[PDB]
Amino acid sequence: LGQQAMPNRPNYIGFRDNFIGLMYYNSTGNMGVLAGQASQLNAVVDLQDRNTELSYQLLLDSLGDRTRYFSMWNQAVDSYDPDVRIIENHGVEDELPN
Amino acid sequence: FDIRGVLDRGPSFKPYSGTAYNSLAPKGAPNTCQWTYKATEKTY
Amino acid sequence: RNTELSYQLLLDSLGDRTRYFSMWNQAVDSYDPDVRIIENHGVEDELPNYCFPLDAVGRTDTYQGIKANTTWTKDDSVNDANEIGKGNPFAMEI
Amino acid sequence: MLPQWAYMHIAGQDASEYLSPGLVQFARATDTYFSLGNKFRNPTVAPTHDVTTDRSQRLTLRFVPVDREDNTYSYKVRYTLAVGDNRVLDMASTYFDIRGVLDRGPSFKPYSGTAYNSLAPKGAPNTCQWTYKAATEKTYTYGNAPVQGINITKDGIQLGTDTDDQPIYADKTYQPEPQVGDAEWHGTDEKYGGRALKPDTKMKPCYGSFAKPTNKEGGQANVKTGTGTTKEYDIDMAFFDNRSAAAAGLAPEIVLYTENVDLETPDTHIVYKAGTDDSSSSINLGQQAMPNRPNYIGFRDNFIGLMYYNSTGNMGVLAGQASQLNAVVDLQDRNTELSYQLLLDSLGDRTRYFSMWNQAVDSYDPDVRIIENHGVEDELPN
Amino acid sequence: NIQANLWRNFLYANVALYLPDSYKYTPANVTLPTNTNTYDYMNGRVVAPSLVDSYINIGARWSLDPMDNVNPFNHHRNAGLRYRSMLLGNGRYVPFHIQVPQKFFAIKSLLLLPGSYTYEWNFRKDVNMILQSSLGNDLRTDGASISFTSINLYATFFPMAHNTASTLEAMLRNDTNDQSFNDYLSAANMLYPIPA
Amino acid sequence: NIQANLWRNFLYANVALYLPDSYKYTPANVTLPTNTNTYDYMNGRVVAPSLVDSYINIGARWSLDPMDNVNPFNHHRNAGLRYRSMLLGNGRYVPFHIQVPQKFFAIKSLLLLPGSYTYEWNFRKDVNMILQSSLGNDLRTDGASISFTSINLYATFFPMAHNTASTLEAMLRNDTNDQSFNDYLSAANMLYPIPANATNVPISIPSRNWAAFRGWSFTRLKTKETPSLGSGFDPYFVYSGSIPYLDGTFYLNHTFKKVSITFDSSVSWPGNDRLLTPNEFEIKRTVDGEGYNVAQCNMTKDWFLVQMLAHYNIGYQGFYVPEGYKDRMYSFFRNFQPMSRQV
Amino acid sequence: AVTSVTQKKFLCDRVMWRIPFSSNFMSMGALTDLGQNMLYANSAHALDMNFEVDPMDESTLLYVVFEVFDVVRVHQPHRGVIEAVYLRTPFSAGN
Amino acid sequence: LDGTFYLNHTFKKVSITFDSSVSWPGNDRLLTPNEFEIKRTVDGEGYNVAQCNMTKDWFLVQMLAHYNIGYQGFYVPEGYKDRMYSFFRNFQPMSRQVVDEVNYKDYQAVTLAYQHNNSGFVGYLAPTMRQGQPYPANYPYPLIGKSAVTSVTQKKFLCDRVMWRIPFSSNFMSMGALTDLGQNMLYANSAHALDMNFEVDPMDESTLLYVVFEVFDVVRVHQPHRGVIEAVYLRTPFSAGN
Amino acid sequence: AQCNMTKDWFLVQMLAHYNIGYQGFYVPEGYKDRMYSFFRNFQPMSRQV
Numbered sequence A: 001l002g003q004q005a006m007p008n009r010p011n012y013i014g015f016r017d018n019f020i021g022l023m024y025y026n027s028t029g030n031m032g033v034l035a036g037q038a039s040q041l042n043a044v045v046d047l048q049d050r051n052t053e054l055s056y057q058l059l060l061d062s063l064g065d066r067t068r069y070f071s072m073w074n075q076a077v078d079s080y081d082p083d084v085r086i087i088e089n090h091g092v093e094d095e096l097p098n
Numbered sequence B: 001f002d003i004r005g006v007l008d009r010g011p012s013f014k015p016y017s018g019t020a021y022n023s024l025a026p027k028g029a030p031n032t033c034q035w036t037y038k039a040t041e042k043t044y
Numbered sequence C: 001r002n003t004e005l006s007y008q009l010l011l012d013s014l015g016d017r018t019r020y021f022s023m024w025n026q027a028v029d030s031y032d033p034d035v036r037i038i039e040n041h042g043v044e045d046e047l048p049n050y051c052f053p054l055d056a057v058g059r060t061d062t063y064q065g066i067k068a069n070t071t072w073t074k075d076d077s078v079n080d081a082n083e084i085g086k087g088n089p090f091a092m093e094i
Numbered sequence D: 001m002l003p004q005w006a007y008m009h010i011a012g013q014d015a016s017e018y019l020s021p022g023l024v025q026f027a028r029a030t031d032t033y034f035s036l037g038n039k040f041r042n043p044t045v046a047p048t049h050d051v052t053t054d055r056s057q058r059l060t061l062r063f064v065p066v067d068r069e070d071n072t073y074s075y076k077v078r079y080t081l082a083v084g085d086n087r088v089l090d091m092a093s094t095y096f097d098i099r100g101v102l103d104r105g106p107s108f109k110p111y112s113g114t115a116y117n118s119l120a121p122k123g124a125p126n127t128c129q130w131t132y133k134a135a136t137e138k139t140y141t142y143g144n145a146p147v148q149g150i151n152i153t154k155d156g157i158q159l160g161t162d163t164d165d166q167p168i169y170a171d172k173t174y175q176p177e178p179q180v181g182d183a184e185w186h187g188t189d190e191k192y193g194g195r196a197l198k199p200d201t202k203m204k205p206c207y208g209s210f211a212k213p214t215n216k217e218g219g220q221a222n223v224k225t226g227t228g229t230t231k232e233y234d235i236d237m238a239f240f241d242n243r244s245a246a247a248a249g250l251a252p253e254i255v256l257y258t259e260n261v262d263l264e265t266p267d268t269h270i271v272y273k274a275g276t277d278d279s280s281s282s283i284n285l286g287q288q289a290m291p292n293r294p295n296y297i298g299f300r301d302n303f304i305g306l307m308y309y310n311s312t313g314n315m316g317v318l319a320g321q322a323s324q325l326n327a328v329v330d331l332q333d334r335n336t337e338l339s340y341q342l343l344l345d346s347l348g349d350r351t352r353y354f355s356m357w358n359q360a361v362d363s364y365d366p367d368v369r370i371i372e373n374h375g376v377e378d379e380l381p382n
Numbered sequence E: 001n002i003q004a005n006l007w008r009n010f011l012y013a014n015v016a017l018y019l020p021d022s023y024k025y026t027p028a029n030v031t032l033p034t035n036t037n038t039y040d041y042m043n044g045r046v047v048a049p050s051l052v053d054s055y056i057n058i059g060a061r062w063s064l065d066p067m068d069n070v071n072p073f074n075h076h077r078n079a080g081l082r083y084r085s086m087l088l089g090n091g092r093y094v095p096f097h098i099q100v101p102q103k104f105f106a107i108k109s110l111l112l113l114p115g116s117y118t119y120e121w122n123f124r125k126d127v128n129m130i131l132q133s134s135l136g137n138d139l140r141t142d143g144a145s146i147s148f149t150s151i152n153l154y155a156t157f158f159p160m161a162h163n164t165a166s167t168l169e170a171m172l173r174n175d176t177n178d179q180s181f182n183d184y185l186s187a188a189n190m191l192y193p194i195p196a
Numbered sequence F: 001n002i003q004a005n006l007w008r009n010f011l012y013a014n015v016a017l018y019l020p021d022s023y024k025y026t027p028a029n030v031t032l033p034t035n036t037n038t039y040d041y042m043n044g045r046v047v048a049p050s051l052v053d054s055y056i057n058i059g060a061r062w063s064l065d066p067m068d069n070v071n072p073f074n075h076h077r078n079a080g081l082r083y084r085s086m087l088l089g090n091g092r093y094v095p096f097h098i099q100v101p102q103k104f105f106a107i108k109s110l111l112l113l114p115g116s117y118t119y120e121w122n123f124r125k126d127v128n129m130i131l132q133s134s135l136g137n138d139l140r141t142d143g144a145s146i147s148f149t150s151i152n153l154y155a156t157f158f159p160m161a162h163n164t165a166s167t168l169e170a171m172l173r174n175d176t177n178d179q180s181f182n183d184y185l186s187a188a189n190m191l192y193p194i195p196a197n198a199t200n201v202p203i204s205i206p207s208r209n210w211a212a213f214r215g216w217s218f219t220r221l222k223t224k225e226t227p228s229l230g231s232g233f234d235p236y237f238v239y240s241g242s243i244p245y246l247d248g249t250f251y252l253n254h255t256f257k258k259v260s261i262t263f264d265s266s267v268s269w270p271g272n273d274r275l276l277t278p279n280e281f282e283i284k285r286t287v288d289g290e291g292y293n294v295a296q297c298n299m300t301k302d303w304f305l306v307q308m309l310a311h312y313n314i315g316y317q318g319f320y321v322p323e324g325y326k327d328r329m330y331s332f333f334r335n336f337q338p339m340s341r342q343v
Numbered sequence G: 001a002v003t004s005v006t007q008k009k010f011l012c013d014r015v016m017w018r019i020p021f022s023s024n025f026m027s028m029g030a031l032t033d034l035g036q037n038m039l040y041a042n043s044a045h046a047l048d049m050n051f052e053v054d055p056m057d058e059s060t061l062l063y064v065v066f067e068v069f070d071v072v073r074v075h076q077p078h079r080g081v082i083e084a085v086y087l088r089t090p091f092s093a094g095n
Numbered sequence H: 001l002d003g004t005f006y007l008n009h010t011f012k013k014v015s016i017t018f019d020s021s022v023s024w025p026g027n028d029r030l031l032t033p034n035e036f037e038i039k040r041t042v043d044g045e046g047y048n049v050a051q052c053n054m055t056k057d058w059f060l061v062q063m064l065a066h067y068n069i070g071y072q073g074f075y076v077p078e079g080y081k082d083r084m085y086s087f088f089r090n091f092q093p094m095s096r097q098v099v100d101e102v103n104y105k106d107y108q109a110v111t112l113a114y115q116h117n118n119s120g121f122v123g124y125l126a127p128t129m130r131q132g133q134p135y136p137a138n139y140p141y142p143l144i145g146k147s148a149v150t151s152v153t154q155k156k157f158l159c160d161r162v163m164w165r166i167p168f169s170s171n172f173m174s175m176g177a178l179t180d181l182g183q184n185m186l187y188a189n190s191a192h193a194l195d196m197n198f199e200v201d202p203m204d205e206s207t208l209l210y211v212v213f214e215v216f217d218v219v220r221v222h223q224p225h226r227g228v229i230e231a232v233y234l235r236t237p238f239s240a241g242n
Numbered sequence I: 001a002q003c004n005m006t007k008d009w010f011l012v013q014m015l016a017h018y019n020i021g022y023q024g025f026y027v028p029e030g031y032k033d034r035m036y037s038f039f040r041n042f043q044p045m046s047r048q049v
């Protein structure tokens, strides 16, 4: 009768910022192709020590305001609550009994 | 690339803190309920 | 013609409508975005929260002091009616 | 590599120069409705001559004082600030780097509320005792005993059992522990133990109460002096049976492990007690505690006040080592600290903080300065 | 003490529960998976609230030493991830429809001239790569999956006057007018192991 | 009632506890220090919570009359001061290491040329001057103290090419290339006593030249919050809160009714019939029968005009909100707060 | 609702009140039109000001900033030589 | 992939040495001229800065590298130049005091299981039902008041989101994407090798050092006729292999 | 954009307010996206039931 329950931990699940991970980049056996239809030389030449996903993160930040969200590209930057990362413990205003 | 598909986020997906069910109940309180016990078998 | 609307749109093009200016009652109608679109992320209620009696015990029984002679006898250096609770403090939960 | 760098627009012309003139005119005429700018690299190329020395040379110098005066009210340092041959120094890059020892003192309290038993009702006592003589002097007790025992005998509360099947009694120096209790809200009569404060430890509300531990198992009993190699504590068991129990059948229902401890209230004060009396007593069981007012203490915004300015007998000096004519001429009439506050505001955003100069402007909560009372959304009972 | 309770619930939900697993325990009478990357493991391990209590470094602004090295973006208060979760909905079963941009530097901003081009791309199905969770559990083991029903390419064209468009194309086919692009990060990227 | 309790606690902690001492009492059975500048006095005086209860001017936006004249920066929700306290740590004992800038206008931006220079400065040990508390208590009496272990000077040098530096040095030694600096505030600063309950503050400036005079700025300070810099140490400074004179935390501007200005005790400035009440600058009116108050408060239309012109050049061609980057932290519009209540 | 009266007021923290010695109060140059004319009404003048304030039951201070030009010119003619010339005008410098 | 960096505070120093002989930047440039000291725990000279354990040298390097600020004083960069992944925006210095376990004479090393604070009102070692009795707390030691314990000070910083930056520029400043020293290396009569050594705080799991060697990673695209697209890639230096 | 708005309409509205649409969709500069502008107010939303 005295068993106690606690809520399960929250776990949000979505696609990543800017849909990172969905398209293969910088991954040798899965290179994208953009070629002239006849003479199909691939104009895309990618390398494993290039980092296209991070390059795009940084480009977006240089071009505009990353605190703004744009649903079309899942453009919604990963963030954290600053008052969770660094605890500022100024106590509580509990002077009055309740 | 315009992508459509079916996603299952699976049984670990929980987009909220707390419960949807009897959230105001003290956390060790039972439902109104019964049990049997034998030290003849009886219902309590 | 619509002069009142024209001025609203004009004001927004010239400056920052989130600022207030009492002289012209310039304080734009708005709403709480969290009221218009409910974001229900639940509540952080993992820890139970308790109400306690003012004295932090609640119901007590009355006890006398006793000392071992094992036989036990009344200890006359001790009050014979001390209020002590057994177990945890009475509590309610919210 | 240079023909390559030109070809890849790593160096060489910008696009308005290397693109065909017809294309540049075309782009310029159409840019506001179809933009071509981002499709053509425009290299930027650092200069390689006459900017930076190739010689061995320090970026940052540290000067230690060549003389100093440590007085009652002030501290004076003298440096030989050296600008070497073929260098210039912007004084904006200079500063005084100060190390020392600060005591903010006993009125510093960088928080609201208490660190100690903050959830305790503010007039609730600790489990404790007092004496009273109406006359023979008796010991009285109030509180609760939360640790359930297998039994209680003259050796105290039995907390467990051996592999030899013999009782294990509480070790009085730390058991029973006040933080332990029945684990659920939910047939016979049960025996219990707990700690209690002795009469000589003057009552304080539970809320705010701290006593340092005197052993690594968290017990707080005062350690007895002149004991030699044996550590002894001020702890005595007190046994109790129901006031209504038959005299011929007395046996302990409750045992309290009573102790004196170094009880303090580092961050709360008494906001109600019935009289001037301080002692443990029946009436003092209901004293009420309130947390001390917060009082942040730091150096000032932009370290105002640390350096003397506009202050006749403590004027700063910058003088050529040839002359001695001081280039600093200051006036009691001038306001250097405020001038600097206003200058900072005109240069940048004073809501941003910069630790290096303690640049963190004084502000207040606008909802405290000007009370906006829209009441409360208390429509649902709770 | 209402204020003290709000503070303690906050610290517990947002900090104590995200402490490294070495700060936690399994009650006897509790059986958890041996797979430590699993939600039931991360949900079942118990954290003593007094590890981050309302008196934690009281009066300080201070991140906890063990938390400095805990990924702070794996958290239910990551507002970007929370928004991305909620864009899809609140249930585990989601028919989705999304638009995914081209990020490869060489073609992402290219002005492409008249002609027919083969354009092919590959898309991942691995839920640990394409999905993100706030706890960071192994979504393969924890039963998430995805199916692609269709992927179409959309392309938008400025309705350019045909003569003006002929002029533009003519200019852009001259090698003098070759387009060029630098990867923004513009780096050779290297990873080196650091043993525990 | 959870919501009512949240609000009542907030009001008590943030407003009622900061009411002037005249609203407080000392219970019989409590002995407080006789020194009223001490923490134990400020912490021990009792405030009735119903002085600022959850029904305080209910439905209004209104600062409390007694609070208008209390320094609102001496407060535990002063976020700058709270951050500066926490930069040091959460304990009373702090070995510290800080960098202190040079602020004197004549040297703080000077480009110094090769040579050896004597550079000397004096630092304060007075805790009420160099430290700040949110309560404002006398830190000397309440046991704060500092010692300096070492002060070193740091300087950074652009690693300039030596031919370039040498050419630069030679040019800067020419008198036609002397450097020059104005103090930003650029004022002669003057303080005049206002005895308790005085309402008129006349001042004379004995006859002088006014060529290049730029104008006047002014405000009101508490004597207890204004230290003397008239010597090495001020024994009468028994306060450690914000010091508006030095830091710009002004908060008594609403207490000015009016200023009038008269050259050569016979020529009123601006006179010229320029102002609605042309013989003075009226800041605010209580009796306002022509209707000269403006902007839903008691500030006059003249004064609003003068301040908007003085800060923004706004006024001759309609009043409007100034561009945010022109309306900075110590600017008029940003800080202007008209208020009303009924009773 | 009870019979009532209304009260109006304002706060304005953080500022100093400003009265520019400019003919239309506007900023048209650091050296103002009227500051320049004072070189032509080229006599000395006395100034009297009378401030009226709300009573406060503690001593206070009127703080007046007289806005002038407060300037230094710095001359460094030879290695290790520095010479500074200070001029505050009007309100030229004291001790 | 995503830029959510959070372990930058764990770097202590890096040395950079060409051909095993030539320390870079060398030339007596930094206060500690043979390496980049990022942070110091022992700091007898007082080279640390901004109220944390970061060094004056490193703070100069990162402010020049991001904003060209350092030679003419330190100050807050303009907000629009100090963006989401920039140094200043993310720099978080912090301090605290704790009991001095060596010199506080009454110190007792009480482990979690034997502490009590809110005995009677909270669950024991679990987020479960309250247990116990009202009793004076034995923990934490007060750092304040008339009986404040003997203490010590700890300081550190976080700097999430950034990558640490060392520009190959003679004065560390951004004067051109093609740096002055990049141009000089063209007149290198020979090829050079590079050693680097990073010193980091130990972490009880496998981690990775991620180095970005900043170069020019370029493509030029030629479309001579309808349906024809030709591309020339050059990454230089560190020219490609895939 | 993860709602029931069409690509056509999103193009017209982005062009109409910002001239954005023939060269990629992206967030307009804040000062061109004012209180009554399209992007500032656009709120796509989903749920399951």
Ligand SMILES: O=P([O-])(O)O
Pocket: C041
């Ligand atoms: O409503 P929250 O952000 O305090 O959970």
Ligand SMILES: O=P([O-])(O)O
Pocket: D052, D053, D054, D055, F160, F161, F162, F163, F164
């Ligand atoms: O390169 P230099 O002119 O500083 O010797």
Ligand SMILES: O=P([O-])(O)O
Pocket: D106, D107, D292, F039, F040, F142, H145, H146
């Ligand atoms: O200043 P305290 O030690 O009486 O609180």
Ligand SMILES: O=P([O-])(O)O
Pocket: D350, D351, D361, D362, D363, D364
């Ligand atoms: O702009 P603030 O300093 O009042 O928050």
Ligand SMILES: O=P([O-])(O)O
Pocket: E057, E063, E064, E065, E066
């Ligand atoms: O409170 P800690 O986890 O930084 O010691």
Ligand SMILES: O=P([O-])(O)O
Pocket: E160, E161, E162, E163, E164
């Ligand atoms: O597209 P047109 O206007 O050149 O026919």
Ligand SMILES: O=P([O-])(O)O
Pocket: E165, E166, E167, E169, E170, E171, E173
């Ligand atoms: O067909 P064009 O490329 O010569 O216009």
Ligand SMILES: O=P([O-])(O)O
Pocket: F285, F286, F288, F289, F291, F292, F293, F294, F297, F298, G008
């Ligand atoms: O006439 P006022 O002062 O009530 O506006």
Ligand SMILES: O=P([O-])(O)O
Pocket: C015, C016, C019, F322, F323, F324, F325
């Ligand atoms: O949009 P602003 O005018 O508040 O900067």
Ligand SMILES: O=P([O-])(O)O
Pocket: F173, G077, G078, G079, G080
């Ligand atoms: O004239 P100087 O440069 O030899 O001092």
Ligand SMILES: O=P([O-])(O)O
Pocket: F097, H040, H041, H043, H044, H046, H047, H048, H049, H052, H053, H155
């Ligand atoms: O030398 P410090 O600033 O790290 O104590």
Ligand SMILES: O=P([O-])(O)O
Pocket: H187, H188, H189, H190, H191
């Ligand atoms: O420095 P060198 O050996 O490449 O000329």
Ligand SMILES: O=P([O-])(O)O
Pocket: H224, H225
């Ligand atoms: O015109 P070509 O040289 O690309 O065949």
Ligand SMILES: O=P([O-])(O)O
Pocket: E173, H224, H225, H226, H227
């Ligand atoms: O060479 P093209 O323009 O006719 O393909």
Ligand SMILES: O=P([O-])(O)O
Pocket: H236, H237, H238, H239, H240
């Ligand atoms: O020799 P590399 O560094 O130009 O590839």
Ligand SMILES: O=P([O-])(O)O
Pocket: A064, A065, A068, I028, I029, I030, I031
């Ligand atoms: O474009 P933003 O920086 O004003 O949001």
